[PDB]
Design a protein around this ligand. Structure first.
Ligand SMILES: [Zn+2]
Ligand SMILES: [Zn+2]
Length: 582
């Protein structure tokens, strides 16, 4: 407790010594509370006018229009300590899984130089604005790096002063850029060197991309076994136990020298003990602490979520196969049995899964998995929207399984080749493209964001009639040479000024390991759509009079947006579609 967090606490107490007060009507039950001090401030969602002017039929669809308007009582819940048998299962599995992940990878520190380049081309690193404005500035100033040095030497000394979380089913904990560096230096290798790639982790999909995920689910479907299970956890980050945080820390057993010590410090001082500043309107700042739950960078969060999810799902598979009888306690011969299962079939069982952070799909050996709930519930990974002891419902068709907020269609091209394409409710796709994050956006910047959505749609959602038409309209309305942008960035092949037909051919044909015939496609008309009824099922407006008038009059909408942006060089992409080709 207070010997590891006191220094951070003491330090904050003193920057607001004219403010401090141990408030009496404080709302925290499960968070240790330490004091308050004076502040007063809050970024809401703005509409992208370029995308909305080119999607007029959607102006009357509540599922689209409501997306642009607008539980912190789940962060304040407590998970019980797992039974001794559960803790044994987790430690054996975690030890074995880090060794597997480490067979073909070398832990290493990430560098200032690597970190600088990241900030100098925008990644959502989650820092705070003070002493310098943006992240960009602080990185070129040498003072910063002395701040970083003091903290670093403090961490080598087993102490911490400035690694404090700032709170804001979402809950995003920003730290100052310095603390993010020290996190990145110690643990960035997990992401930077692709430890959760499919090739390296067998269950993972890190760096895949939506054009790969459906082919991966279809490969899992090919395995002999039972239904496909895709159970979501209720508030995954809130159910991470101190025992989970300790099994994650075992990655330091593969490390050496300084690195081993820097990594141990991040795990001990920032993850297994945390200090957080929260805004309360009754507006003060509350300095609360706790030992458990997830609070890391979004990117280390992804890797450790994937790891701990892989662990939980191998254990649930062990329970379904009757590798152990009870979670109360493992016998000695049950430990040998668990160790032996892992060595004999562990890699085969990883390959039966697709795991992306807290999201999973499992194709178990058979349907006993559905009612194998004791380890899963005791680890605290309680399933969303189903009674705790009710058996899971599995999917009989891989095209119906939900994964990474998508389902996947099998689409046959006129030449017989097979596309496995990503899909979701079209209202969700249109509603997101109509939103910009942040203000101060110029017309040009708003246009370049609309173009990024348009190019993503041409590459991923070309099979949806409304999206191929709206993508062509947006790319016709935005100056041909203007570069697509995004303010927070898997593989993003649509972020380019290259011709989208050439990019389509590279992604879907040339680089696609599931396509044997590499004959290029010569026009967009070779590239198929979903069945018209399937397109409607997935939210198409095809068949409505509003949509017919939009399609027929699209050159008028394009010309409206061209007039607003002004006299620039434009391309007409609409004749890439049969119906505008004269
Ligand atoms: Zn620190
Ligand atoms: Zn669909």
């Amino acid at each position: 407790n207070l010997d590891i967090i006191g220094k951070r606490i003491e330090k904050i107490k003193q920057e607001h010594e004219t403010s401090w007060h141990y408030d009496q009507d404080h709302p925290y039950k499960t968070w240790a509370y330490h004091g308050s001090y004076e502040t007063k401030q809050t970024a809401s969602s703005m509409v992208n006018g370029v995308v909305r002017l080119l999607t007029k039929p959607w102006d009357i669809i509540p599922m689209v229009t409501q997306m642009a308007m607008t539980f912190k009582e789940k962060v304040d819940t407590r998970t019980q300590e797992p039974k001794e048998g559960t803790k044994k299962l987790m430690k054996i599995t975690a030890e074995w899984l880090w060794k597997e992940l480490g067979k073909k990878k070398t832990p290493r520190m990430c560098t200032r130089e690597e970190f600088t380049r990241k900030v100098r081309s925008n990644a959502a690193l989650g820092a705070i604005f003070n002493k310098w404005k943006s992240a960009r500035e602080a990185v070129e100033d040498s003072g910063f790096w002395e701040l970083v040095d003091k903290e670093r030497n403090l961490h080598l000394e087993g102490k911490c002063e400035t690694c404090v979380y700032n709170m804001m089913s979402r809950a995003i904990w920003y730290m100052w850029l310095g603390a993010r560096f020290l996190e990145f230096e110690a643990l960035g290798f997990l992401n930077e060197d692709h430890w959760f790639s499919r090739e390296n982790s067998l269950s993972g999909v890190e760096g895949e991309g939506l054009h790969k995920l459906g082919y991966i689910l279809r490969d899992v479907s090919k395995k002999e076994g039972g239904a496909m299970y895709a159970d979501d956890t209720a508030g995954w980050d809130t159910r991470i136990t101190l025992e989970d945080l300790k099994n994650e820390e075992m990655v330091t057993n593969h490390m050496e020298g300084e690195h081993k010590k820097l990594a141990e410090a991040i795990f001990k001082l920032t993850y297994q003990n945390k200090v957080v500043r929260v805004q309360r309107p009754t507006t003060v700042m509350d300095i609360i602490s706790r030992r458990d739950q997830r609070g890391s960078g979004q990117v280390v969060t992804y890797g450790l979520n994937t790891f701990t999810n892989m662990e939980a799902q191998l254990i649930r598979q062990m329970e379904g196969e009757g590798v152990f009888k009870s979670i109360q306690h493992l016998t000695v011969t049950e430990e040998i049995a668990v160790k032996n299962w892992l060595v004999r079939v562990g890699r085969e069982r990883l390959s039966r899964m697709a795991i992306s952070g807290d999201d999973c799909v499992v194709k178990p050996l058979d349907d006993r998995f559905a009612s194998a709930l004791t380890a899963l519930n005791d680890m605290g990974k309680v399933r969303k929207d189903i009674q705790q002891w009710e058996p899971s419902r599995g999917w009989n068709d891989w095209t119906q399984v939900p994964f990474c907020s998508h389902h996947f269609h099998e689409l046959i091209m006129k030449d017989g080749r097979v596309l496995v394409v990503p899909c979701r409710n079209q209202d969700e796709l249109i509603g997101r493209a109509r939103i910009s994050q942040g203000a101060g956006w110029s017309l040009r910047e708003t246009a370049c964001l609309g173009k990024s959505y348009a190019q993503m749609w041409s590459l991923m959602y070309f099979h949806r009639r409304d999206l191929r038409l709206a993508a062509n309209a947006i790319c016709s309305a935005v100056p041909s040479h203007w570069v697509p942008t995004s303010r927070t960035t898997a593989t993003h092949e649509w972020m380019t000024t290259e011709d989208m037909l050439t990019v389509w051919n590279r992604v879907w044909i040339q680089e696609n390991p599931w396509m044997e015939d590499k004959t290029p496609v010569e026009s967009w008309e070779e590239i198929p759509y979903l069945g018209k009824r399937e397109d409607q099922w997935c939210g198409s407006l095809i068949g409505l009079t509003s949509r017919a008038t939009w399609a027929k009059n699209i050159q008028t909408a394009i010309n409206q947006v061209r007039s607003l942006i002004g006299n620039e060089e434009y391309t007409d992409y609409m004749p890439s579609m049969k119906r505008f080709r004269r």
